[PDB]
Amino acid sequence: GQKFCFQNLVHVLQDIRYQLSFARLRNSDLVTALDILSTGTSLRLANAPTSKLYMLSESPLSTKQILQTLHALNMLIRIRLSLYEIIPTPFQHFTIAN
Amino acid sequence: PLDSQDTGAVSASSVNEGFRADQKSKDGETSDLIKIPRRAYELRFLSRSLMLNFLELLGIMAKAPEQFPSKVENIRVLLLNLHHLINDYRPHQSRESLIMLLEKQLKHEESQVELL
Amino acid sequence: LLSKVPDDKSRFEIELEFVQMLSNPWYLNFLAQHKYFEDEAFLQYLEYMEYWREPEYVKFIIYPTCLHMLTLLKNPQFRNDISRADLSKQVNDEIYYEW
Amino acid sequence: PEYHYVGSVDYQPTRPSAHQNLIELYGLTELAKKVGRVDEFGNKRKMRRSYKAYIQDLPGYNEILRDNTIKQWLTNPIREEVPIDIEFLHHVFSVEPGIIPGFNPKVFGLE
Amino acid sequence: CRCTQLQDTIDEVATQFYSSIHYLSSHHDFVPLPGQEKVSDSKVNPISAEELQFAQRDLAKDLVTKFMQIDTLINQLPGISTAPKHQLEKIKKLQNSIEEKQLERKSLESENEDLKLQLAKRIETFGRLSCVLFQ
């Protein structure tokens, strides 16, 4: 019975420690909460390679956007080509199309 | 639940307090002749008290083990009060952390505006 | 065509828990093995799960992952690869690391 | 100026204490003398693993068997008495002197 | 930050309570009295008498240091009004502030992108012209 007493005390102490973890409260992860305002876990996607490879964008594509992409793209090929190192001389005349 | 857990709901709560808007309470009472903030003093007090109650516990183990339930109850309420009170500290801390975050967004905003 | 037998309150308790299940990757893997992604009804029910992103509703959801998981599952090639065990482990490990 | 819950309850020590030599206290020392591994003179005490020490006194070659029936006779104890008709058993027990096959008197252990 | 860590320290204290007692119960206790010490060596797993004393002294030191740490952290603790009015007002000021700064950014950003389009056109003229003429 005396031994049982020792053990029993240890178990009660563990139990109240358990209740202890149940009673504390920790400062909010506002980051995750704000990400979930916008309905994704932005963290888990950016971080993950399998997410980013299997991620897919929202289906709307702004057609005014895609024009502006095109403009910036053409413009960027001009950038490249003007400072692209090697053009073959038969290629020396080029048109930066649409 | 729909709201967070309550300390009075679990066991007996050793103290109560409230601080006014834009004011804090600190007083000078004598145990080691302290002159310090009032919430913190109640804390320190509960902690040293817990220390002592544990010393008691060791004793009642080496002298009469079957008596421990009483004393571990002392211990338990002391810890639970410690926590309930620390919990009373947090909401301001969460708010000021949000403040610091909003301050970061503003800083990025003004810096981005000026860079532009 | 059996008559529907649902409950109002119960099915939002349930739809919350189901979203949670969607957070688990292994549940997605089993789901794919069982070829639940073959059914169009399932995919419409997924869009019905989109109601859970709304603020008052998402305020209830416990595990954020599911939301992300849901957008992940909108790609069908992803569905056939969560049938795969290797990718499954990749996903689990990816959370575990974020965690 | 007083901390809470400190000395709230007074307790006397436990009635028997482990620190006391309980063998003496409850008078088991004579038992230990009688059954211990070591004699009080210091010589060793031999104790058969079986109870042969008591079968040793009794006549006959006696094998040691394991039968839990007396336990069962205690789980299902019987009523207060059984009827007994001496004359019938006298009649039943008169047996002809002829031999009995397959039975040896080794159990008798006369020789 | 501070508050959560201190919370962790009191949790640490409780864990130390039962951990300590359990360690002590686990390790050798046999005390002979009058009689001679004798052990069930296997189940016993004894430790040296000196090892015992040293270990319990060490355990006391660890616990008292934990309590000192909690005390000093309580001193580290800065007093704050439980009332959120001051913070809330700060909050509202920041939100209004970032709002108006965001409006200014938006105006200057539209003007920016218009400018960018203009210069981009002049660029494009330059590039095709230069290429053709020199080549």
List residues of E whose CB lies inside 8 A of any D CB: 31, 33-35
E40 interfacial to chain A (CB closer than 8 Å): no
| Contact criterion met (CB < 8 Å) for B61 and A23 | no
Measure in Å the smallest separation between the Cα of D33 and chain B Cα atoms.
31
Residue C80's identity, in one-letter code, is N
Neighbours of B42 (CB within 10 A): 16
Q: E45 with E27: CB under 8 angstroms?
A: yes
Cβ distance B63 to D5 less than 8 Å, yes or no, reads no
Provide the token pair at A68: 């502006």
d(C-alpha C91, C-alpha D4), whole Å: 53
Taking CB atoms within 8 Å and a gap of at least 24, the contacts of D87-96 are: none
| CA of C45 vs chain A CAs: smallest distance (Å) | 18
Tell me, in Å, the resolution of the deposited structure.
3.4
- Residues of chain D contacting residue E31, judged by C-beta atoms under 8 Å apart: 19
Do the Cβ atoms of D19 and E33 come within 8 Å?
Answer: yes
DSSP readout, D38-101? B-TTS-B----SSSHHHHTTSSS-------THHHHHHHS---S-----HHHHHHHH-------T
CB C73 within 8 A of CB C79: yes
In Å, how far are A43, C93, E108, E111, E129 from E115, measured between CA atoms? Answer: 36, 48, 10, 6, 22
Asked how this structure was determined, the answer is X-ray
Domain of C28 in residue numbering reads as 1-99
Q: How far apart are CA C34 and CA D65, in angstroms?
A: 62
Cross-strand pairs, B27: B36
Q: Is A16 exposed, middle or buried (0-12, 13-18, 19+ CB in 10 A)?
A: buried
Total domains, chain C? 1
Report yes or no: C22 and C37 within 8 Å, Cβ to Cβ.
Answer: no
- Please state the three-class secondary structure of B46-92 as a single string: HHHHHHHHHHHHHHHHHHCHHHHHHHHHHHHHHHHHHHHHHHHHHHH
A89: its two tokens: 């001389």
Nearest chain D Cα distance for residue E85, angstroms: 35
E–C contact: 3+ Cβ pairs < 8 A: no
Query: Coil, strand, or helix at residue E57?
Result: helix
Query: C22 at the A interface (CB within 8 A)?
Result: no
Nearest CA in chain A to E14: A17
Calculate the CA A72 to chain-centre distance: 25
Length of chain E: 135
CA angle B60, B65, B67 (to 5 degrees): 70
Question: Any idea of the CA torsion for A76, A78, A79, A84, to the nearest 10 degrees?
Answer: 120
A51 and C58 within 8 Å at the Cβ level: the answer is no
Q: Which residue has the tokens 């003229």?
A: E125
Residue A13: closest CA among C77, E21, C97, D70? E21
Chains contacting chain B through 3 or more C-beta pairs under 8 A: A, D, E
Beta bridge partners of B36: B27
Q: Which amino acid belongs to residue E15? A: T
- Dihedral, B67, B68, B73, B79 alpha carbons, nearest 10: 150
Within 8 A by CB and 6+ apart from D3, the residues are B45, B48, B49, B52
- Report the distance separating Cα B59 and Cα D108, nearest Å: 67
Q: Rounded to the nearest 5 degrees, what angle is found at the Cα of E50, between the Cα atoms of E46 and E52?
A: 55
Element (H, E) at B36: strand B34-37
Q: Which subunits sit against C, judged by 3+ Cβ pairs under 8 A?
A: A
Q: Rounded to a whole number, what is the distance in Å from the CA of B93 to chain D's nearest CA?
A: 29
User: Phi then psi for C31, rounded to 5 degrees?
Assistant: -50, -45
Whole-number Å distance between alpha carbons of C82 and C90: 10
* Break sites following residues in chain B (C–N > 2.5 A): none
CATH number at residue C79: 1.10.10.1340
Q: Are E129 and A95 in contact (CB under 8 A)?
A: no
Q: Report the relative pairing of strands B26-29 and B34-37 from DSSP bridges.
A: antiparallel
Shortest distance between the Cα of B87 and any Cα of chain A, in A, equals 6
Q: Which residues share a beta bridge with B26?
A: B37
Cβ–Cβ gap A23/B5 under 8 Å: yes
Q: List the structure tokens of A64.
A: 């005014």
Residues B82 and B50: beta-carbon distance below 8 Å: yes
